[PDB]
């Protein structure tokens, strides 16, 4: 009885579909009406150039008008906060991003430039305010980082109610790590965090009924942690070269999947899991923010 | 053979002791500048006017001058809004907060009221701003919770280092419990946090290396969940006075134990009185 196999990319398939039809809805509903996303850069990354147009495209294909700034290496710190005010204060815009890392050749607080998005508008969910409701239960309206939000929908795409289970999340990041934990104990889990100081790790884990890794260590929780019937989700993205595979490199997660899927009931493969979820998830944060002010 | 008693009343007369001496000498360096502290009450609850008679008592004693504003209970949000801006841009406060509950005959959004105050001077740490900074590990520029201050003070004071540890909270609130995850959980111990979804809550209990309860229900967490050894935290008030956790029991498995009273909550005001002596130095810096 291997575990069920929960395909990242057929699910994030049928998000985006669904948020396209929401889209055309919304816009019908009230003519006029323009669901907008804004993405900020600074500098010109060959990394960030690739996420941006993957999802400028995913926007597009939904029916999200998306707009892109990008400026200049020479850039300063107050010309990139000047853009975030003017962000905020656009009414057109529903939802805005800053792409990070900042790539610029002047010293630029990525913290400061970070918290000055408007609460309503952080679509990405790292400002200060955004991760303090989170953190406190404000789940109903406040938004939630794409990652660990792809994580939550993949747990509850298994059917198995959350509430009263333990769950177990590896990694305590403000990216992944926190908000996963938070999502998890105000959906009712009684929840474990575990991290790089945390001893005897493997027991920890096995208490698992639900177990979100996301350490960045390849394939460190093996199978014989995790405990019988759970539902793993495997956050990791670590590269290993492999000369059998097209590109000459393979993906594994932060979790030993061979060993792994027969224990579990429900497991998250690397690569198509966790990863494919995170564009769509973007989306459907942007989506929100938009129904929100159209309210 | 019993616990040792973490004595809350013996420590935050250290604490205060402590400030106060602080406070003499901040105001011998600028004669003249006075820490100011302010308590926004609403309604005329009871026990509400005992907990603030006990943080002006404690100010006064150190040395910051502390002012009460109480409204009356037909008081709107709106008004309430008014006062916290009017306390937001009065210069000679440092620091300022809210009594909770809110006690009005109309609808008033806590949330809001909480989160329209300044950052700067949120000594109770109650701001999503400042929420958000704990929740993320942040610790270098926010105010925290009074209680889950004290708590962890408490802890310290077993000598135990808390790195490594499995620690239990049970409770998940934004005043206690939320906060007091983080507390321990950014100083290097594995958290686990149980609230009333909770199943087999003595089987969780059981795992804690340090236990910090702080549900409201009376002497609900058994001294048999307890983990031989254990250091245990009580935060509950409940009504004779008795905290969330059987203490007879608890002490006789506990390492360390919270009494009730004169545990956690003496903890809270000396660490509330902390937060302000160090809104007040913040601003002369
Ligand atoms: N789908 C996506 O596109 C997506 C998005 C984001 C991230 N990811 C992936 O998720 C992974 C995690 O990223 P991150 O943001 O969390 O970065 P990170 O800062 O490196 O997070 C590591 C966290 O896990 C802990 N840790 C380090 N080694 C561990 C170990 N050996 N045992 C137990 N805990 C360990 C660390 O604790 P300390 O706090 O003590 O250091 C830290 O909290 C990365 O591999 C990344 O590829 C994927
Ligand atoms: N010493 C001080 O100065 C000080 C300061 C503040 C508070 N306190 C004391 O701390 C206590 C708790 O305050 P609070 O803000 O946390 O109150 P609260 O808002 O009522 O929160 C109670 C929490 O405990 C959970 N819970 C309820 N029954 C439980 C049960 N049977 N098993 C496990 N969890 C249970 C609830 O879960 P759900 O979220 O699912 O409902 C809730 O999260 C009070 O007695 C208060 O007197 C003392
Ligand atoms: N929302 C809310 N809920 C609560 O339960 C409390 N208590 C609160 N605010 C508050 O200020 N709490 C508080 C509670 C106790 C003290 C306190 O000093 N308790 C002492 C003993 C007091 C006594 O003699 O009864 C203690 O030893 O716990 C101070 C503040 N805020």
Redesign the pocket.
């Known amino acids: 009885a291997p575990a069920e196999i929960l395909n990242g990319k057929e699910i994030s398939a049928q998000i985006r579909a669904r948020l396209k039809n929401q889209v055309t809805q919304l816009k019908e509903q009230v003519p006029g009406f323009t669901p907008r996303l804004a993405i900020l850069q600074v500098g010109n990354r060959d990394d960030s150039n690739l996420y941006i147009n993957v999802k400028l495209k995913a926007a597009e294909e939904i029916g999200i008008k998306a707009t892109h700034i990008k400026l200049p290496r020479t850039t300063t710190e107050s010309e990139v906060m000047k853009y975030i005010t003017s962000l905020n204060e656009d009414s057109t815009v529903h939802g805005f991003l800053v792409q990070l890392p900042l790539d610029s050749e002047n010293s630029i607080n990525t913290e400061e430039v970070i918290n000055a998005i408007a609460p309503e508008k952080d679509v990405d969910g790292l400002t200060s305010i955004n991760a303090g409701r989170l953190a406190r239960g404000d789940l109903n309206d406040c938004f939630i980082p794409?990652?660990p939000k792809?994580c939550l929908e993949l747990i509850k795409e298994t059917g198995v109610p959350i509430a009263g289970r333990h769950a177990v999340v590896?990694?305590?990041?403000?990216?992944?790590?926190a908000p996963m934990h938070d999502l998890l104990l105000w959906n009712n889990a009684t929840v474990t965090t575990?991290?790089?100081?945390?001893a005897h790790?493997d027991e920890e884990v096995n208490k698992g009924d639900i177990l979100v890794v996301?350490?960045?260590?390849?394939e460190?929780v093996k199978g014989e942690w995790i405990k019988p019937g759970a539902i793993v989700i495997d956050?990791?993205?670590?590269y290993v070269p492999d000369d059998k595979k097209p590109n000459g490199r393979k993906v594994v997660?932060?979790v030993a999947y061979d060993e792994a899927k027969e224990r579990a009931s429900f497991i998250t493969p690397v690569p198509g899991g966790?990863?494919?979820?995170?564009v769509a998830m973007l989306m459907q944060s942007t989506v929100e923010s938009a129904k929100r002010f159209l309210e």
Do not use: E, F
Request: proline fraction near 6%; aromatic fraction near 0%.
């Open positions: 794409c990652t792809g590896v990694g305590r990041s403000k990216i992944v790590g575990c991290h790089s100081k945390t790790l996301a350490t960045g260590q390849p460190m956050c990791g993205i670590n997660g932060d966790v990863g494919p979820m995170t």
